[PDB]
Design a protein around this ligand. Structure first.
Ligand SMILES: COc1ccc(C[C@@H]2C(=O)[C@@H](O)[C@H](O)C[C@]2(O)C(=O)O)cc1
Ligand SMILES: COc1ccc(C[C@@H]2C(=O)[C@@H](O)[C@H](O)C[C@]2(O)C(=O)O)cc1
Ligand SMILES: COc1ccc(C[C@@H]2C(=O)[C@@H](O)[C@H](O)C[C@]2(O)C(=O)O)cc1
Lengths: 157, 157, 157
């Protein structure tokens, strides 16, 4: 399975600013960690990574996964989680599993971060585990996809 | 008259997901339905179509219309209707009639879709007729333009 | 010191619409006025100007200044002030002083203009002086930077 990993605004600045809620691990490092979770679990999973500060590039990227070779999306829309009805609408039209990840616990910060329009549109949401949350999402995605295919095996029969 | 039609985010995915509020017709077909309306009524109207998932491309495009061939704009800002103060400000400086269209009835859906910052800046708003809404906007644009022209022609006399 | 000046959406349209709150001076004219203020003060300041209608372009530009030789930013996020948590987050990681400027007094307009997420992340905010507000920001920026430097080399010894 090809799994698309989408990283929203300012996530490329990880490990260069703000080790209060963020630590000192970089975005590339998290992606390396995801890669070795796949490698070593021996999962038939090809990860593709995409980071952007543009809401429209996120929407473009989600729309291009439709009818593509991608079976699922792992997304951290960053600040756009709280504001982007348009990303939420793209998610609802994706026709495939989408898991939202947050590094931080968005229930425990400013009032303006508590709402997630994107999260409400995703099947599941993970927050507050830092980098590990992405490994959690990979484990879930693999199980969701296995379960979906095995359901559609015994489906026709 | 050159009339510019702007379609916002996810509108390019019509007929490719969600047959309930949206049906099964595509964006390209709606645009062919519009041309057909210009013909069957012999309107002296040249249409240019533009879809984007980018808030800034929408703003650039409205701005580009200022002191241009374009006599008016028919716009469906999509989800950005409810959030984009910047698109509303661009509409306010366009110096020409702008009409907002929605496919769905935005008074009858989620609470976060009820506000249209963009619609409030437009001269008039149309919602809940599906594809047909765009032809209704066409008919109004022609009438508004004719009345501006006549008023101006009888302003010098 | 190189100083970065970022101008948000619709600001390029100054003088080309709406002398009610906005007057008749253009964006290019404002930037010459700032240049003049530097020249006349014999300030050792190199200004770089950037305007965009794109939220992600503003965020890329703020990030690009991290680690560079730009020592400060003067920003008018325009309508994104009221909406963009993502731009506020970028300001928070900038690692350098950032001053927000508005031409108009945003406490005295529509209720939706009152909140500035970006202004709250900035060290200081200036509003309602028209173009003059940008020379006020320049004066402050120079004084803040000289203060910061007079402190670094004195804490060293
Ligand atoms: C140093 O750059 C950052 C800035 C913010 C975050 C947190 C993410 C955001 O961008 C926030 O706007 C959002 O509220 C939560 C966030 O999505 C997360 O916890 O992963 C991560 C790295
Ligand atoms: C198939 O993809 C979509 C998703 C949403 C819409 C509706 C338009 C939007 O994008 C919404 O976010 C908005 O609230 C209403 C909408 O403007 C419309 O009814 O045309 C259309 C097609
Ligand atoms: C001629 O075009 C404009 C439109 C609005 C402004 C005001 C600026 C904005 O873009 C607003 O959305 C914001 O609320 C205040 C503003 O930032 C300002 O006073 O500079 C300036 C020029």
């Amino acid at each position: 399975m090809k799994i698309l990993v989408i990283q929203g605004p300012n996530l490329n600045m990880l490990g260069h600013r703000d080790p209060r809620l963020y630590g000192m691990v970089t975005l590339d490092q998290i992606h390396e960690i995801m890669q070795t979770f796949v490698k070593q679990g021996n999962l038939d999973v090809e990860l593709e990574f995409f980071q952007t500060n543009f809401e429209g590039e996120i929407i473009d990227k989600i729309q291009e996964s439709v009818g593509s070779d991608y079976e699922g999306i792992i997304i951290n829309p960053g600040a756009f989680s709280h504001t982007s009805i348009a990303i939420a609408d793209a998610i609802m039209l994706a026709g495939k599993p989408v898991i939202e990840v947050h590094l931080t616990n968005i229930q425990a910060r400013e009032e303006f971060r508590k709402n997630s329009y994107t999260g409400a549109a995703c099947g599941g949401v993970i927050m507050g585990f830092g980098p590990l949350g992405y490994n959690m999402a990979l484990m879930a995605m693999v199980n969701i996809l296995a379960e979906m295919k095995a359901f559609q095996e015994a489906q026709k029969n």
